[PDB]
Paper text:
In this work, we have sought to understand the evolutionary history of lipid II targeting glycopeptide antibiotics (GPAs), a vital class of nonribosomal peptides used in the clinic for the treatment of resistant bacterial infections and exemplified by vancomycin (Van) and teicoplanin (Tei). Since ANC1-3 domains display polydisperse elution profiles in size exclusion chromatography, we instead turned to the characterisation of an Acore construct of the Hpg accepting A1 domain from Tei biosynthesis (A1tei), which possesses a homologous pocket to ANC1. The MbtH-like domain Tcp13 also exhibits the anticipated fold, containing a 3-stranded antiparallel β-sheet and an α-helix adjoining the centre of the sheet.
To visualise how the ancestral GPA Hpg pocket evolved to select alternate substrates, we turned to structural methods. The Hpg substrate is coordinated by three H-bonds to the α-amino group, one to the side group of D196 and two to the backbone carbonyl groups of L295 and G289. The aromatic ring of L-Hpg is stabilised by hydrophobic interactions with the sidechain of L295 and the main chain of G264, whilst the phenol moiety of L-Hpg is hydrogen bonded to H237 and to the amide nitrogen of G263. The orientation of the H237 imidazole is maintained through three key interactions, two being hydrophobic interactions between the imidazole C5 and L261/L287. A water mediated interaction between E201 and the imidazole Nπ further contributes to imidazole positioning. This Glu residue is widely conserved among NRPS A-domains and serves to maintain the desired orientation of the loop immediately prior to the key α-amino coordinating acidic residue (D196 in A1tei).
Residue numbers in the entry:
A (entry chain A): 9 to 131, 134 to 402
B (entry chain D): 2 to 61
The structure:
């Protein structure tokens, strides 16, 4: 599948439902589709062709959502660049990804590198679409992991759709999801694409970081689901856990989240669902998750959890044999959601996206993390393999 | 040390039906659906084989 295909089902079902809320600008599903179609026509007219990478340099806004969908409708893949990155980082991402064009705004126009065509989103071609396809690239997102060397993770449409359309998200048409993660990072796949394939709405956060007070205001305005980075979640959980009250679900992940933080939220908010996400950019936002239902208490340990529907995890020893529960080993992720690999880096791809001994002809992603199973099949994180010098 | 990072290990290159390449430790049974196309050879030699011969990441 592709996210545009899944979105099209929602445009047909409820075209006049709200899709994007940005300050006083409100876009319905049909309005979002039509705007993206017009910008797609503009992109095709500037020469964008299937498989091209198109860089994006924009502040979060309705125009950003329109732009990503337009790039997809033109058959191309987006290369998201944070407008606040230093110029050498931007130049590297554009050149390494092979992007010859960049969509920008008046405000970000000066950040387009020399030699790159700027397409100013706020500036007569007719709406036209080539159409997204499942095997084509959807985006190239840059990750340095724990290495310090940035690599472009090339993710196909099929993997983005497997993530966004997953039945476990439980996002419904009445939901409103707060959008504030950088679109250069893949938490944005939950904040943007999950609600849109589900019939819900994306609520663009006012500029600046989302703190407890802004979260309370967003909830009062109708936000029902919100993802916070592990750092932000831990802070609000310890300082103002009642600020999550009224959410249907709070989500968090990335860095380590201690069980105590989750326990603080559950104590303050008995009826909020709390979801912990785990996974690398290489397997599209998250591969495993742990959900605390309303009223349930978290144990002494917060698992990274169980594989998402359609995914699998393995914990293998140094001989590539599966270990028994309670034994720490190397974590490998498989099933749905794998990236194609690292753009222009086949050798690196071949040493991390490796053959899966448990599934014919398939690959598994070597996370570089350590984990152990619980007796009934959830996973506990045990640190990065390259950070065991910190465990004493 | 993870076996895929062992610089003193012996390695194969494997290729599946989609043309995707994988390094593989020579001590491990080759998974179903994968064919050995290079090695046993050093880890670095296998990376060179992959870089030379896997030119399009897209699955065939
Ligand atoms: N921890 C590093 C990184 O984030 O770059 C890593 C090593 C091996 C691996 O298979 C994945 C990641
Ligand atoms: N995919 C990123 C990561 O590499 O860590 C991620 C972000 C947020 C989250 O809740 C889970 C994973």
């Amino acid at each position: 599948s592709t996210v545009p295909e899944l979105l099209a089902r929602q445009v047909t079902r409820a075209p006049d439902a709200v899709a994007v809320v940005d300050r006083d600008r409100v876009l319905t599903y049909r309005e979002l589709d039509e705007l993206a179609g017009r910008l797609s026509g503009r992109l095709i007219g500037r020469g964008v062709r299937r498989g091209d990478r198109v860089a994006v340099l924009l502040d979060r806004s309705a125009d950003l959502v329109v732009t990503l969908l337009a790039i997809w409708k033109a058959g191309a893949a987006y290369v998201p660049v944070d407008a606040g990155y230093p110029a050498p980082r931007v130049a590297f991402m554009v050149a390494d990804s092979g992007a010859s064009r960049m969509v920008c705004s008046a405000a970000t126009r000066d950040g387009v590198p020399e030699g790159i065509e700027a397409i100013v989103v706020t500036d007569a071609f007719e709406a036209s679409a080539a159409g997204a396809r499942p095997g084509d690239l959807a985006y190239v997102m840059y990750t340095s992991g724990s290495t310090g060397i940035p690599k472009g993770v090339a993710v196909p449409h099929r993997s983005v759709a497997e993530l966004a359309g997953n039945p476990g998200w439980a996002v419904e048409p009445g939901d409103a999801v707060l959008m504030h993660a950088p679109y250069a990072f893949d938490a944005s796949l939950f904040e943007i694409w999950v609600p849109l394939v589900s019939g819900g709405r994306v609520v663009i956060a006012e500029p600046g970081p989302v703190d407890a007070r802004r979260l309370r205001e967003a909830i009062s305005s109708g936000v029902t689901r919100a993802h916070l980075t592990a750092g932000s979640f831990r802070a609000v959980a310890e300082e103002s856990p009642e600020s999550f009250a009224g959410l249907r679900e709070v989500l968090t992940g990335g860095d380590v989240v201690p069980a105590h933080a989750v326990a603080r939220v559950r104590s303050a908010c008995p009826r909020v669902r709390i979801r912990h996400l785990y996974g690398p950019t290489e397997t599209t936002l998250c591969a495993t998750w742990h959900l605390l239902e309303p009223g349930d208490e978290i144990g002494p340990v917060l698992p990274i959890g169980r594989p998402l529907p359609g995914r699998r995890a393995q914990v293998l020893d140094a001989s590539l044999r599966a270990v028994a529960p309670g034994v720490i080993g190397d974590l490998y992720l498989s099933g749905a959601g794998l990236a194609d690999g690292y753009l222009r880096r086949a050798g690196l791809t071949a040493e991390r996206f490796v053959a899966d001994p448990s599934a014919p002809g398939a690959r598994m992603y070597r996370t570089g993390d350590l984990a152990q199973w619980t007796a009934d099949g959830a996973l506990l994180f045990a640190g990065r393999a390259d950070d065991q010098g910190s465990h004493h | 040390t993870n076996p895929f990072d062992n610089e003193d290990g012996s390695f194969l290159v494997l290729v599946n039906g989609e043309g995707q390449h994988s390094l593989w430790p020579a001590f491990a049974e080759v998974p179903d659906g994968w064919t050995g196309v290079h090695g046993p050879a050093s880890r670095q030699d296998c990376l060179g084989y992959v870089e030379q011969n896997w030119t399009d990441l897209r699955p065939k």
